Amino acid sequence: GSFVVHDIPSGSYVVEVVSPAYRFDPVRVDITSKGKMRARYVNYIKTSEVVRLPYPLQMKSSGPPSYFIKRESWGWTDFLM
Amino acid sequence: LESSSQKFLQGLVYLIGNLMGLALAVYKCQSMGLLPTHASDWLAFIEPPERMEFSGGGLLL
Amino acid sequence: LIPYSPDVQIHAERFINYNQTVSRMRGIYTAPSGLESTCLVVAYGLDIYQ
Amino acid sequence: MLTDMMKGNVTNVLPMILIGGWINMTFSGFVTTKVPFPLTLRFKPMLQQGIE
Amino acid sequence: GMSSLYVFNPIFGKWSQVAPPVLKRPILQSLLLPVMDQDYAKVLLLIDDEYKVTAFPATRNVLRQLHELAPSIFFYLVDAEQGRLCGYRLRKDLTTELSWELTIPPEVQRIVKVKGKRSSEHVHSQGRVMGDRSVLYKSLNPNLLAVVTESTDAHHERTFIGIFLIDGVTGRIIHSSVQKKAKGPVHIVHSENWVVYQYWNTKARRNEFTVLELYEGTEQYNATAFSSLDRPQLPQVLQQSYIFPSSIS
Amino acid sequence: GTVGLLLEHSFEIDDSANFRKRGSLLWNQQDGTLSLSQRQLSEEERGRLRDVAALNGLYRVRIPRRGGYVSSFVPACSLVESHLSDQLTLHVDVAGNVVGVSVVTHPGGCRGHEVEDVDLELFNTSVQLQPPTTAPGPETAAFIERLEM
Numbered sequence: 067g068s069f070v071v072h073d074i075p076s077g078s079y080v081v082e083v084v085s086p087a088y089r090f091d092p093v094r095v096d097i098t099s100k101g102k103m104r105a106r107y108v109n110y111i112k113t114s115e116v117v118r119l120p121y122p123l124q125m126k127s128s129g130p131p132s133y134f135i136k137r138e139s140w141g142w143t144d145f146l147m
Numbered sequence: 148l149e150s151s152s153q154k155f156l157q158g159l160v161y162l163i164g165n166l167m168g169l170a171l172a173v174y175k176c177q178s179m180g181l182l183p184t185h186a187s188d189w190l191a192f193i194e195p196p197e198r199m200e201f202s203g204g205g206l207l208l
Numbered sequence: 209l210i211p212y213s214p215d216v217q218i219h220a221e222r223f224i225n226y227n228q229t230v231s232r233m234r235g236i237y238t239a240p241s242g243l244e245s246t247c248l249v250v251a252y253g254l255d256i257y258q
Numbered sequence: 259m260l261t262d263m264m265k266g267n268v269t270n271v272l273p274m275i276l277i278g279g280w281i282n283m284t285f286s287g288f289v290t291t292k293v294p295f296p297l298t299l300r301f302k303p304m305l306q307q308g309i310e
Numbered sequence: 311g312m313s314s315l316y317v318f319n320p321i322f323g324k325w326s327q328v329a330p331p332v333l334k335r336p337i338l339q340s341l342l343l344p345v346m347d348q349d350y351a352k353v354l355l356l357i358d359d360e361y362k363v364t365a366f367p368a369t370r371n372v373l374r375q376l377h378e379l380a381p382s383i384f385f386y387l388v389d390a391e392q393g394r395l396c397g398y399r400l401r402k403d404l405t406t407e408l409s410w411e412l413t414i415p416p417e418v419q420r421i422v423k424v425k426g427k428r429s430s431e432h433v434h435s436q437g438r439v440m441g442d443r444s445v446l447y448k449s450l451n452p453n454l455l456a457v458v459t460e461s462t463d464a465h466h467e468r469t470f471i472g473i474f475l476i477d478g479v480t481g482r483i484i485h486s487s488v489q490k491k492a493k494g495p496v497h498i499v500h501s502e503n504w505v506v507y508q509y510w511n512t513k514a515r516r517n518e519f520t521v522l523e524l525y526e527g528t529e530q531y532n533a534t535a536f537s538s539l540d541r542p543q544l545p546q547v548l549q550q551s552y553i554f555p556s557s558i559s
Numbered sequence: 560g561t562v563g564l565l566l567e568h569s570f571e572i573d574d575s576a577n578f579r580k581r582g583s584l585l586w587n588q589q590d591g592t593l594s595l596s597q598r599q600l601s602e603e604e605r606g607r608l609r610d611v612a613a614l615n616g617l618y619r620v621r622i623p624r625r626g627g628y629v630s631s632f633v634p635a636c637s638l639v640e641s642h643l644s645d646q647l648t649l650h651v652d653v654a655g656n657v658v659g660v661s662v663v664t665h666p667g668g669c670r671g672h673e674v675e676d677v678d679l680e681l682f683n684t685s686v687q688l689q690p691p692t693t694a695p696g697p698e699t700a701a702f703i704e705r706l707e708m
């Protein structure tokens with residue numbers, strides 16, 4: 067596993083790994099013209115620096131996202147109420 | 148209850164009591180919202196009007 | 209009424225496409241059915257899904 | 259003189275309400291029939307009670 | 311610049327033995343008339359580049375009904391390179407006449423997409439409940455078109471994007487909304503009376519969602535016959551802003 | 560900087576191919592004031608207005624933009640049934656560009672009772688300017704403070 071992307075201009079971009087299987091959390095990346103790379107948490111309401119982490123993107127998938135809803139039946143000890 | 152002229156008038160007061168009770172019941176009826184008497188309820192009944200002189204076009208040209 | 213807040217989150221429960229995915233979503237066509245509350249959704253593009 | 263009205267038969271509807279509640283609990287989202295008589299929208303919460 | 315029309319069957323596949331010919335210049339636009347005639351069919355007419363109406367199902371009763379309608383059918387044409395918004399209408403039998411005209415400078419703004427109202431749409435409730443118990447009437451327009459124009463010049467700050475709401479019946483702009491810091495792909499959807507268009511802001515890297523709704527007052531009009539010749543009123547326009555972290559293809 | 564605009568009106572039986580100068584309209588881009596001054600119609604013009612009104616024709620207004628050419632149609636039957644009340648509105652862009660005009664009549668009826676010659680003497684018009692309006696953006700600043708407070 068590794069994503070290597072070239073042919074990019076200056077600006078800020080959100081890296082997200084798309085998979086029908088185990089999902090990933092998007093990570094915001096800031097690219098400077100001089101060559102500095104600063105990665106931060108994705109924030110839309112706020113537009114400041116929250117937490118700074120090292121540049122070598124290491125995403126850790128939590129697991130399969132819940133696609134289907136759950137429906138529960140009524141218990142035998144519970145229907146006596 | 149007819150036993151004299153004066154009690155025949157008290158019977159009318161007995162009836163006025165029931166009249167007042169009915170008035171109070173109707174007041175509570177309207178206060179809760181039992182009688183419609185309002186625009187939204189008639190909105191629930193109004194039907195759409197008919198459309199005339201239709202137009203049309205697009206962006207093909 | 210629910211108080212106004214400019215924060216719309218994408219819930220995973222409200223996902224019609226559970227497993228089947230469309231690589232390129234060119235367009236979606238919705239057709240009304242006949243019962244009352246049923247709409248047939250067909251998403252076209254690189255693949256077809258209904 | 260007051261008790262003649264206080265006793266009455268005011269509180270004799272609740273057991274039927276229990277039956278209605280159980281019946282409505284069994285069928286959550288259902289539409290049985292329509293009544294021809296026009297009704298006001300302020301009775302809809304009591305009438306439907308389960309349809310959004 | 312060739313135009314052709316085919317008449318086939320969607321059930322079996324074999325085409326029928328009826329097909330009109332096409333001459334002059336290619337067909338510009340077509341419109342489906344709701345009125346039915348002949349046996350159980352609808353009548354179709356097309357506009358040529360010579361500004362003439364051609365009827366597909368040539369039938370005496372069809373033409374009689376079309377002539378009886380006469381000043382009831384309007385036609386609006388939209389251009390991107392020309393940037394000219396035109397309105398023609400039928401008079402007596404078959405002939406065009408210019409009624410309402412709009413022009414837009416191509417260098418400043420550019421035409422992108424134009425959506426309208428679906429023909430098969432019925433609205434159940436014509437009003438809305440308000441705070442106490444009062445009714446609020448809506449503003450439903452069966453003949454109303456929405457134009458989306460953008461800025462030709464693309465800059466980090468200088469970005470022009472707006473929505474025009476024009477009646478196809480009579481040239482009259484109801485509401486003209488304009489942004490100042492949005493660019494890129496813009497998607498507009500039109501509904502009963504609410505318009506939903508999405509954009510992207512350059513000043514802050516985000517996608518903003520604008521919801522436009524048209525509302526009338528507490529009193530209703532004729533409410534029996536709707537026409538755009540009358541109704542000299544301006545509906546209230548409501549706008550709201552939201553955030554959507556996606557692209558919305 | 561004050562610029563004049565040409566306002567013409569159409570009057571025929573059922574078609575529309577003639578146009579005559581009705582008046583002059585001054586427009587100040589810098590200030591934002593719009594003044595109108597038209598001449599008065601003659602008796603023959605009045606009568607022709609009457610006979611086109613009873614036939615339910617169309618009132619086309621012709622306005623050239625410095626080129627572009629704008630036109631707008633309005634029913635004159637309501638003009639004659641009611642009193643003379645026209646409202647002119649110019650539509651402009653962010654810069655000095657003209658989109659078009661629209662004529663709107665407040666009565667907007669179709670009863671058609673009668674009109675007297677005493678009515679149709681003076682021209683009653685009001686000109687308005689409608690510049691583009693700026694849409695609001697997400698008010699997240701208040702939401703943040705509400706969440707904090």
Ligand SMILES: *[C@@H]1O[C@H](CO)[C@@H](O[C@@H]2O[C@H](CO)[C@@H](O[C@@H]3O[C@H](CO)[C@@H](O)[C@H](O)[C@@H]3O)[C@H](O)[C@H]2NC(C)=O)[C@H](O)[C@H]1NC(C)=O
Nearest residue numbers: 085086087088129130131132133134135225226227228229
């Ligand atoms: C998304 O799709 C994948 C398939 O590409 C799903 O995995 C497969 O799901 C099916 C049922 O949807 C499983 O079939 C089951 O087989 C057992 C016997 O092995 C049978 O007893 C069950 O009744 C059922 O037919 C299949 O085993 C499973 N395959 C694997 C490798 O897991 C996946 O579950 C889908 N994602 C969801 C539903 O969230």
Ligand SMILES: *[C@@H]1O[C@H](CO)[C@@H](O[C@@H]2O[C@H](CO)[C@@H](O[C@@H]3O[C@H](CO)[C@@H](O)[C@H](O)[C@@H]3O)[C@H](O)[C@H]2NC(C)=O)[C@H](O)[C@H]1NC(C)=O
Nearest residue numbers: 196197199531532533534535536537540667668669670671
């Ligand atoms: C709301 O709009 C409707 C439809 O435009 C109006 O009803 C229509 O009114 C016109 C004019 O009064 C009626 O025309 C009549 O024609 C007969 C001959 O057919 C003529 O003798 C009359 O003098 C009149 O011109 C038309 O029949 C009528 N349509 C219907 C279906 O009743 C209505 O008046 C409008 N209401 C308001 C408050 O504006």
Ligand SMILES: *[C@@H]1O[C@H](CO)[C@@H](O[C@@H]2O[C@H](CO)[C@@H](O[C@@H]3O[C@H](CO)[C@@H](O)[C@H](O)[C@@H]3O)[C@H](O)[C@H]2NC(C)=O)[C@H](O)[C@H]1NC(C)=O
Nearest residue numbers: 641642643644645646665666678679681682683684685686
């Ligand atoms: C010539 O034009 C002027 C201005 O357009 C006319 O003045 C307007 O007159 C109408 C009725 O004659 C006024 O309408 C009134 O509106 C109020 C609410 O705003 C309402 O309470 C009244 O019952 C009435 O409907 C209007 O306010 C007034 N001013 C405007 C439109 O700015 C004038 O009447 C015209 N003269 C002729 C001879 O037509």
